[PDB]
From a paper:
Here we show that [name] utilizes a small ankyrin repeat protein, Bd3460, to protect itself from endopeptidase activities during entry of prey. We demonstrate that endopeptidase complexation by Bd3460 prevents cell wall decrosslinking, and that both the Bd0816 and [name] targets bind this self-protection protein via a common epitope. Previously, we assigned prey cell rounding to the action of two secreted Bdellovibrio peptidoglycan DD-endopeptidases, Bd0816 and [name], that act to modify the invaded cell wall via hydrolysis of the structural 3-4 peptide crosslinks. In summary, we conclude that we have identified and characterized the first ever self-protection protein encoded by predatory bacteria—ankyrin repeat protein Bd3460 from Bdellovibrio inhibits the prey wall decrosslinking enzymes [name]/Bd0816 and in doing so protects the predator from the shape transition that this catalyses in prey.
Structure and activity analyses of DD-endopeptidase [name] revealed a highly active enzyme with an open active site adapted for prey peptidoglycan diversity, rather than self-wall maintenance (this was also inferred for the homologous Bd0816). We next utilized a modified version of our original [name] construct (starting post signal peptide with K38 mutated to become the new N-terminal methionine) that represents a more ‘native' signal peptide-processed form of the DD-endopeptidase6. Upon comparison with our structures of the uncomplexed proteins, [name] does not alter in conformation upon binding, whereas Bd3460 undergoes further flexation around the region between AR4-AR5.
Residue numbers in the entry: 38 to 150, 165 to 438
The structure:
């Protein structure tokens, strides 16, 4: 069962600022991963698009010749394989190849994809597998080549040998007298958001949402920002994934109007810092690693957008650039993908045809100024630096 729940839009240049749409534009529907755009807005407002996550390494020489290292985490929600490979590269550039005790605190988050001890157990497990495995030359080579494109140098065939990896809480970490402290800054937040909104599992959005205070903080933010409450927008996580079962699902939900208000606000907060939607959201046809990279037709090169797919919904929202100006849009479809596998692709085609009509009946597409960015978790200021 594929059918329209709601479609709405507004011209960026509207003097009335009245959102246009069908009669369902003020009823709540599942959002799926367009939720990530709301999480994006929150993060931009709270942190700023140039914010960097400052992970600290406390490094102490051992009588051996080797090092102990304690990671004081910054809750960087994008510390994954790429970033781990870069850390290893950096350790080798700093002449560290052997670590005796590697320790890490509760703020050191790791994306291989409850409670503090148990969360840290999973990070430890992941770390121990990852650092005890040879770095894959094919994956590293591709990564080193992407890094060189943004002028980041990485080591040749890097490696690390770690004796032990343990959880040490921030409160119980005693900084050694002859430790050095080095900082490994993330790429800017806008870049992390770019990566998240191109294509991701739940991990980044969910960790951002928790970092910022979770649901109680989110509802206070939305009330302050939008004069909105839970009848406009009801979140349970940052990502929009199912928090229930297949039979009784629990999805983030919002009105079509709220999605437009989000896009407007996001656009405004970004412009204040000189940035565009296409700095944090995928560009149809241009962003090849995204869910809209194979979009063609009039959307190609003209459209900034985020996809969503859950059992009960297929969604799209963003901005289309037309000869009549930029236009914010959201389309929310109903699906029953658990019952009928064909619904996601059928829904997706109906959304594209709806957005193509929105473009084609507003004078046709006007290209945006955009060249495919590579949203790596580090940039040229990420190098280990003695702070």
């Amino acid at each position: 069962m594929v059918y329209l729940n709601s479609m709405c839009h507004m011209a960026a240049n509207s003097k009335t600022q009245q959102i246009q749409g069908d009669d369902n534009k003020d009823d709540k529907f599942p959002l799926a991963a367009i939720s990530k755009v709301v999480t994006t807005l929150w993060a931009v407002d709270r942190l700023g698009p140039d914010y960097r996550f400052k992970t600290k390494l406390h490094v102490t020489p051992t009588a051996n010749g080797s090092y102990d290292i304690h990671i004081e985490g910054s809750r960087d929600p994008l510390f994954g394989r790429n970033m781990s490979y870069f850390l290893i590269s950096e350790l080798n550039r700093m002449k560290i190849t052997k670590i005796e005790k590697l320790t890490f605190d509760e703020n050191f988050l790791l994306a291989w994809l409850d409670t503090v001890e148990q969360q840290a157990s999973i990070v430890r497990a992941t770390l121990t597998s990852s650092f005890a495995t040879a770095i894959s030359p094919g994956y590293y080579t591709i990564l080193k080549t992407k890094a060189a494109r943004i002028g980041v140098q990485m080591s040749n065939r890097p490696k690390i040998d770690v004796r032990t990896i343990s959880f040490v809480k921030k409160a119980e970490f005693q900084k050694n007298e002859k430790s050095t402290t080095m900082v490994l800054m993330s790429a800017p937040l806008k870049t992390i958001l770019k990566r998240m909104n191109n294509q991701s599992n739940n991990y980044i959005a969910d960790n951002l949402y928790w970092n910022l205070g979770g649901t109680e903080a989110f509802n206070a933010y939305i009330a302050g920002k939008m004069q909105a409450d839970t009848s406009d927008i009801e979140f349970h996580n940052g990502s929009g994934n199912n928090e229930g079962s297949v039979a009784k699902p629990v999805y983030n939900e919002a009105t079509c109007e709220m999605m437009i208000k989000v896009l407007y606000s996001l656009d405004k907060s970004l412009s204040a810092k000189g940035y565009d939607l296409s700095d944090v959201m995928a560009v149809a046809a241009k962003d090849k690693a995204s869910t809209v990279g194979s979009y063609g037709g009039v959307m190609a090169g003209s459209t900034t957008a985020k996809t969503g797919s859950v059992n009960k919904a297929k969604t799209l929202m963003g901005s289309v650039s037309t000869k009549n100006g930029e236009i914010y849009f959201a389309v929310l479809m109903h699906t029953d993908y658990d019952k009928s596998r064909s619904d996601w692709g059928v829904a997706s085609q109906q959304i594209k045809n709806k957005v193509s009509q929105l473009i084609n009946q507003n004078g046709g597409p006007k290209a945006i100024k955009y060249t495919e960015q590579l949203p790596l978790p580090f940039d040229k200021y990420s190098y280990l630096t003695k702070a």
